[PDB]
Amino acid sequence: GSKWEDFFRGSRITETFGKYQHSPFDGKHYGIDFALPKGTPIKAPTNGKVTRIFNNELGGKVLQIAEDNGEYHQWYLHLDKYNVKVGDRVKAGDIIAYSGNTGIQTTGAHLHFQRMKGGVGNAYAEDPKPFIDQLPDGERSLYDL
Numbered sequence: 001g002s003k004w005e006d007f008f009r010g011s012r013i014t015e016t017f018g019k020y021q022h023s024p025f026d027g028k029h030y031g032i033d034f035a036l037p038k039g040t041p042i043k044a045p046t047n048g049k050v051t052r053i054f055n056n057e058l059g060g061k062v063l064q065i066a067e068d069n070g071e072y073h074q075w076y077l078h079l080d081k082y083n084v085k086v087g088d089r090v091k092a093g094d095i096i097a098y099s100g101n102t103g104i105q106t107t108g109a110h111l112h113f114q115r116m117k118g119g120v121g122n123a124y125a126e127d128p129k130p131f132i133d134q135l136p137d138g139e140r141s142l143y144d145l
């Protein structure tokens with residue numbers, strides 16, 4: 001039929017930036033988490049460049065991108081696959097990688113997205129929720145789902 005609507009929930013988010021209830025008593029989450037199945041295409045939200053590619057025990061596969069600002073940096077955890085390589089230039093809405101569950105132990109497959117200012121790590125992090133609320137696709141600038 002040529003027209004239809006339903007009331008079904010928008011936004012794919014799970015764990016937002018700030019306090020973190022899976023902690024024993026106190027603690028923060030340094031980014032934003034999106035409920036996305038394995039093989040979902042992940043895109044750069046902003047024009048950037050790839051500046052490291054690695055794995056670790058808590059994150060799984062990790063993509064690292066610098067913004068063209070000369071001061072902002074980005075991490076993408078739990079990935080299955082990469083469409084880009086270190087040194088390559090990227091654009092807002094360019095496919096960079098694919099979602100998986102390569103470092104997750106509870107709450108199922110999701111992208112972690114984490115933005116940082118002045119250096120790279122949790123101590124450098126800043127709140128991406130209002131930074132996504134300004135994007136041309138909103139949070140859908142991060143994912144094709």
Ligand SMILES: [Zn+2]
Binds near residue numbers: 015031032033111112
């Ligand atoms: Zn996360």
